[PDB]
Structure formats: structure tokens, C-alpha cells
Amino acid sequence: NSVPGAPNRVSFAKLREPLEVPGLLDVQTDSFEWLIGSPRWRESAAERGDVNPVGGLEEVLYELSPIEDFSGSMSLSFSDPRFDDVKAPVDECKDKDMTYAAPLFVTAEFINNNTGEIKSQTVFMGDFPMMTEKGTFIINGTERVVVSQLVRSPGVYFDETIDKSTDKTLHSVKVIPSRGAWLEFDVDKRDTVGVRIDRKRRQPVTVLLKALGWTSEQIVERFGFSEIMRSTLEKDNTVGTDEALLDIYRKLRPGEPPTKESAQTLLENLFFKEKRYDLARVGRYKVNKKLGLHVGEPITSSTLTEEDVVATIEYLVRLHEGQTTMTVPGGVEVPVETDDIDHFGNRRLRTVGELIQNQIRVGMSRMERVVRERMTTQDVEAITPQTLINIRPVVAAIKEFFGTSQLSQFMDQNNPLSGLTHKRRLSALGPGGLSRERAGLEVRDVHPSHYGRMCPIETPEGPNIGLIGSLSVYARVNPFGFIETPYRKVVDGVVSDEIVYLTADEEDRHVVAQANSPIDADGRFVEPRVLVRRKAGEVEYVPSSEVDYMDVSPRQMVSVATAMIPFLEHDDANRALMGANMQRQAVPLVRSEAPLVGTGMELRAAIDAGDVVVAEESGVIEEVSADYITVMHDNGTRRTYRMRKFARSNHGTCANQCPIVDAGDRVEAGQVIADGPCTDDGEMALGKNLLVAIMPWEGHNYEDAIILSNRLVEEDVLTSIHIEEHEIDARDTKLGAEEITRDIPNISDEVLADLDERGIVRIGAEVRDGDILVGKVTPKGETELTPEERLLRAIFGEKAREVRDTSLKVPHGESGKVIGIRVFSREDEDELPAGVNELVRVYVAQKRKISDGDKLAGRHGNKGVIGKILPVEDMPFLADGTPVDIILNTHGVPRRMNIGQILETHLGWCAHSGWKVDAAKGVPDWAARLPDELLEAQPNAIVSTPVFDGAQEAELQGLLSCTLPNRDGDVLVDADGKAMLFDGRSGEPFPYPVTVGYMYIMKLHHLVDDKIHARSTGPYSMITQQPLGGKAQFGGQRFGEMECWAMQAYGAAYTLQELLTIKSDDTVGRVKVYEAIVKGENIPEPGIPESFKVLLKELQSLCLNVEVL
């Protein structure tokens, strides 16, 4: 639907979709799209209001310029930031390990005050990383992604608390700007106020107010209504402006002689000097909105004007009096209520744009205080604009952000959906925000405002639940950073089509309708009443007159990864969350078959994932080949697409790609041309459809274990590809320079039958565990060999050498062909790190079959390892002779409340056999509603079932009584949906009909080849003699504490001591036991370790004489 060449996936839905899904990747591209300032965003935020737009960079320069020294004799100004064209295209930048950027130019001008000059000079600011078409960045060849961050928005926050002593209500306020000072207006258990600005112990409201230039009469005039401040003024003890101004200054410093500076300069240099205290363009808006200030205004400023303060002051006193509304001279009346910190109306989302703008600003705040410092001590009249601009700090800051920053993460891409959902993520943790251990379980809970903005289902299971969430489908980011959602406004019970994006603030004030309401052909609520969501957040019920807004469609709450689970409204939240988190972990198979029964988010989430080569302009195919395709547009110029074949992903998967068109086909703009890793015909296909039964089979699938058939191994139905990358480097050492050469110290000649004449192996060599990949050799140095060895070299006429055999050998348990070999050299201009003459990398491919130990999983969160793989001949086979493929257990279905995975098992069979409603005289009651043209479907037909609007419990049962016979008229699955299986092992049939169907399962990326480990004796750390391993090093297992407790509970002293002494640290013990073992003698009885003759020395180093008696 609304896609040129998409497949025809029948749908079970009943409602319409007035609004179609947005540009899922918009939150990254159209969000970036504001630092550069491309005309695209110009028109976007110029047609929908936005009187005057200013780019992300321009908004920095226009706050930096004009550079002015303290002498006031000269000035520097910046303007017109523009970008050139990129140097190297994406692909090349991904291959040569060079960062994908473009040049940045800013017009700079210096002017003198004595006489003045008009020197304008285009200053090159440096390289700037650009955002690829998919929304990711390329840094040093690695594809990284920036993740938006949730942060409470600067502004005014009120609140109230109860004291246990007297049990009254104390109403506090706070004003939190970006890079400023905080001043809570507390209201103590007693009176009167909590003026304690900048956290200095307190102050009285009349002090700061009067010090602002207020007569003691005006205070009682405005704020007397409102008598609680009468006591504040009475007990203030101070009369006059400076009489309390110098007291404020005292409490601030303290301990310094008061003056006229310490009285007025301070106050005017903490709130009204827009260089040390400035609340960003957002705060200046959240404050006006909260209070009833200039709100109707193009207003643009960052100084906390006196007025605002006074307002909030009385606001506070009005709160702890008992009232609802508040007004101010000339201001729009606002309601009085304590704000909530977690409400999605006070929690903005700094996207990838503001994070880069912040880094650019922090850099400018280093490159800025380098001109005005080299502006006085330079030769005046001899300086040119470029002579002052030391750009280096800015590029350094940028590179220090895109690297080593905990918000720039390697794009988790082992399949299209994992990549798509790595973007659109919002993590409340990270820099500038809260932490993971210092944030109580309040920011984790789901708030009734998250409906439509953040999905409540999708979230990690580890110690991050609630801290890392994902955007919804229809949501959209405001120009400030607040998340919006589209509603349809209904006027007088007549549902219209005027879509209106509401934020989180202006949603509670109104009344929101429900998605699935009985509208009758016009927009009239058939029934007299309707469900609603009132301000507070409760679920009320109202008449069909107050309803003004209504959701555009169900599944608004659901994210993208979640909107692909069929029958979601039948699964529990735990299992639904596990299913949503176990899809971004699947692996791309070799065939990539589409799912038989999914939802509408398949076709519309692959073309947006950025791994499906989409025809750009409607043309006609001219030539196709596994390597590339060419389209001949209707207007002359053609265009050649280059599909990437067998490219390694970041997690080791395969990035294959293959055309899906012929040499004559006509194509239109948007249509799919080449499939992706996990796509099929241009739509997500993460796994395969397998015939599954639901019986427990003789104890091989016990407690989540799964058994398979050999067919899935013979017919390459779950075979996957994996490409690993090994790397070695040859540097210069103290004795010389390491050389990568075919020559080697004492070694055989059968371990060189695959290395080319110059070391590195030849492409196509079937390597295995232990073999050699790169021939390296390092200078030995100089030593002196004992007799036994000199009398041995003489015998074998092999004079010794001065090199060590330190090559690059394949790690343990790894095989497969050698695909690619990359080589960089300092002698060949191939830039590399310091002290590195050469650097080689070797890619090894491997086709992994399914094997017991590999984890599998369906969409509904059900998972399990593969325990047994029976031959194809002993497996419960239907009456025809078709063996079931997988055999799931029953005891896992009921107690986990995921009966969803059963419904799709039933439907999965229907859509596999194909039905035809027998309504040739009249549509049966059960199926007189759902669609038309869905009363019959050819065998092996595709279908769809939207998340909360799909098939119905009473419809499957109607689609299960029409299951046309396979070849000879013989219905195999009776009405209830159960077959009569024959026991392939014993021969006779099972005594009860068993449930069978077609389930869509996926092979996760937790294969045993990754987990299996072992270590007999490896390398040990030098400082601490405990075992240690790395890439090609075993590593050693960790015998923790509770294990020692268990050992002691057994009373096994010798085993514990052995695990503690001759296996971890005792160097004289490990070798003395290894020698015994290898010689076949008795293991020496564990004595007292040598780690006890070191405690005595460490004590005696303190003048403590400890003696063993």
C-alpha cells in the first residue's frame, strides 16, 4: 500500500489510517539538518510558522561575535558559515579508514577602534563530519551513531512537601537555568521564606526584592494579599537598599568589606549579565508559559529580567495559601499548581544537533579566549583576521566528542531492524544527565504521559530498565526538544481529518478520545458516550460532546520494534518486552525468507532502514549483475547503483545484497531494487517458517529446550555467514624494526605451504585452528645459551639466530576460507599510528550450520537452546509423511501468559493451506465483517494482523474450518486445530490429537562457538600472577566468593586451597605441579603458599614484628 512494487499482504484490520507513518529516520536527519542549515530545514521551519530561522552554527557565532577585549580598542566578528562539498564519498571513506567530513568556512572580520579597518578574510575552520543518507556518521572508517538524551528542561519548578514534626505543607520553588545560579524560594516549617539564592543558607524575600530597587511600601502593596510576607517584612530587620544589599553580599562571599561594587555589580553580574547566567532559548519559553509573561511575542532573550522573579515570588506565596489561578499585570492568567519532574512536558530531548552545538560552543570557549589574550600582546596594525584565529582547539574538541564520548556508540548492526532501533533511542543516562546508581526508581516507572511518545514495552532487561527507551512510531520532535504526537480534532462529535501535533503540555488540558471508537461514515460517535484520557491521567468515561481530540490509530504507544509482533494484545508485558528485545539480536540467514503472518510494519521499516537499494528516479532497467545495476531514466542520464557484497558488519554478520529485477522491468521512484541482509522482496524477514508441534517429546525439550529436524541442516534453512577480522602490526623496537616476512626461526616446511612469497596468506586458503596467517619476526636481542643448548646447535648444524617467532596465528576454534587481505605501510604513505611501519588485516569467512547449543526464538519472547536434532526419519510426521520441523514444549505456554505464540501457530497453518469461506449463499455470521475479498486465499498466502487491530478469537475458529486439502482431499487439521501424528520412532500413532502449525522463528546471535571457552595453562599477568587472557588467550575462569562459601560448606579443604593457591598465584606451585603431572608423579601436598611470606614483609615495613609460634 502506497509503495510502487511492494508485495500484496492481505490485512485483517478494520479501521483506516488517516495519517501514514512518518520518515522513521527523521529524528536524526531532519534533526541534524539544523546545525549545517541546509535550505531544506530553512523551508521546513519557515513554512510552519518560525518567522525567522537561524541555523545551529549561526546561533553560536551570533552569541560569540563580536569579540571585544577589555581595552575596547578592537573587535573581531564572525558570520556566514558555509560548507564545501565532501572530499571522499562514503564507500571510499569506509575503506581507507578516513573520516567522512567536509570543509567549514566562516567569514571573519577585524575592526579597529582607533581608526578602524574592514579586513574580511574567509577563515578555514577545519573538517566537519557530515551525516550519511541513512543517518549515521563515519569516523575512522567505523560507522557510529549519536543517541539523543533526555534531560529536564531549564525553567521554573514548584513543589510541595509535608513535614513529620508538625505535618503542615511547605511549598518550595526553584529556577534552574543552563549555566547559571539557583535560587529556591523555600517556605520553612515556620515562616517566612526560603530566598536562599545560589545555596547560601537563606535570605528573606524582602531583602532581594528591596535590593532590586523596591520601596518597602510597594512590597506590601503588591504582595499583601498574600499576608504571609508581612511577617517576612516585619522580621527582616533591614531598612533600605544597601542596608540589606551589603548583607546579601556578606552571605554571598562571605567575609569581605562591602562596597558599591559588592552591592550592585554582583546582582547585575549573576542574573542580568547575559554572559555568565543565560537560560537557553527554551527556558525563556517555559518560563513565559508557566508564568503568563510576554508569551505572545517574538521575544528572544536570556536575561532573567527582574519582573519574572517578582512574579514567581508572589506565585509561591499564592501556592501556599490555597488557590487555583494566578494573574499578573498585563499577563495572561495561568493556573497555579505544583509541577511534576517526570511529566513529559518538563523533560526535553537533546538530539544529535544540540549535542554537536554544545561541543562546538565548548570549543569556541577555548578558541575565543586565545585571541583576546593574543590581541593585546600582539603587534597592533600588523594583525590580520587569520593571524588571531587558532582553529585547532575546535577540531580537537570535535574529534574528542565523536570519540571517547559515551553518547557516540558503534552502530549495532547485525540486521536492518537492530540498526533502525539503535537510532530513535533515548537514554536518560550519560553526560550532563543523571547516573545509573544515583537515580531512584522514579525515573524508571512509566508515566501516563509516555502514551504516544515513548514506548513502554521496548526496553533493556539489565540494570537499565526505564533509563533507555525508544521513540514511538507517529511521534515527532518539537523545535525545542519536546516530543509531539498527532491527534485528530473532533468538533461537535464529528470526527474531522484536521491532524494537529500536540505536545505533552497542551494535551492534559484537553480531552483525548480513544483510537477504536464506533465512528459512522462521517465522524459521529455512534454510541452516546466514549472513553477518554482526562488531564490527571486517569481513564474516565464521558459523553460524546466533550471529546475534542482522538488518536489517529491504535499502536501509537508502540515503538517500531514492537509494532511487528502479531497478536501483541494477547501477550504479557514481560514476554512482549523480551520478544521486542530479541528481534534486534537475530542474524541474517542465506535465503532470508519473508514471514507468513506479520503486521504492516514489515514493508515500511525495511525501505527506511537504509539497507534496501531504492530506485531513485522512475526509469527502466538496462543492465543487472550481481555486482551492480544500471537504470536508464526517462530523461537521458542513467544511474548505476553499486550493491555491496559480502561486507563485514560491526558484529561479524554478512552484509550481502542482491538485485531483484530483470533486464527489462520498469521501475518507479521508491520501488525496491536490491534486497538486504534480512530482507526479502523489500520487506523485513528475520527468520524462517517452520512446521511446529506443541507436544513434549521424550524429554529432549525439557524446560525451554528445543528439538529440530535434520531437514533444517541438510537444506541450509538456518545456515548463516560470519566474517571475522584479524589484525597485526609491525613497528620499530629498541633493537630494530619488526619485519613481516616469510622467513621464520626454527620451523617446519609444512606450515608454509599456504603463505605467499611475501608472508601473508593467499586468498582462498582453507585455514583452521592454530595455522599461520601473517609471518612476523622480531629481534631477539642478545643472550647466552647454557652448554646443553650449544652442544645441540652444533650437532644439528643450525647456528642460532637473533629473532623471535612472534607471528599472527589463528585463535582457538576458528576456521573457514580467507576472503580479503588489507595492508597499509608507512613507507607507502599509508598513514598509521606512531611507531608503526606496517599493518595487515585478514578477513576469514565461515558458514555456520544450526547446531545443538544455538539459541532460537520466536516473536513472542519464547526462547531456548537447541538440545537435540533427530534424523529426518524419526520425527512426528503428519498422516501424509511430512515430518514436523521443530517440537516446542507445552509446559512453557500456560504459566508465561504468551498464548499469542499459539494463535499465530493456528493462523500460520491457514495462511499456509489457504481457505475459502463456504459462504456461497450467505456470509456466515462470524466472518460477515472483517474484510471483503478475504473469504478465500490461495495456498501459501501472505497475511497481516496489526498490533491492536487484527484477527479475532472468533475469526480464526472460522478460518480453521476451511483448510483446503493438500493434494488429495483430506483435511489434516480438524476444527480445533489438531492433527493426528504418527510416532516416527515407535511406529504407532499417538493416542491424542496434537496441535501443529507454522511458526516463524529466528536464529539469535548467541552461538556456542562464541561462548565455549577453556584453559589448561595460558599467560599470567605480570603485576598480579593471576591468569590473564585476551584475543587469542584462554583467559581463565573466575572462582568467586560464594563458590568458596559452598566449598567450605562441603568441608572440602584441599580442593578449596588448590583452587586458591596452585591455580591463581603461587608461581613456585604451578610449575611444580605441572612438572609432577607431566612426569606422572604425585601432586605435591599443598603447603603454606608463598603469598604468606610477603604479608610478613609488608608488615615489618611498618615496624611490626610478627612471629609465628
Binding site: 520553612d188 543558607r201 537563606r202
Partner: peptide
Amino acid sequence: FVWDEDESEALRQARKDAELTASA
């Protein structure tokens, strides 16, 4: 009487610790 609280009890300890550190 807007003297909040704990200002004296905190300042006497701060000054005492500062005097100790200067004595060191």
C-alpha cells in the same frame, strides 16, 4: 528573624576545621 538555621552550627565547624588545616 529570617535567620534560617544551622548557619552558626555549621560555620563554627567549618572555621574550626579550617583552623586545624592551617595548623597542619
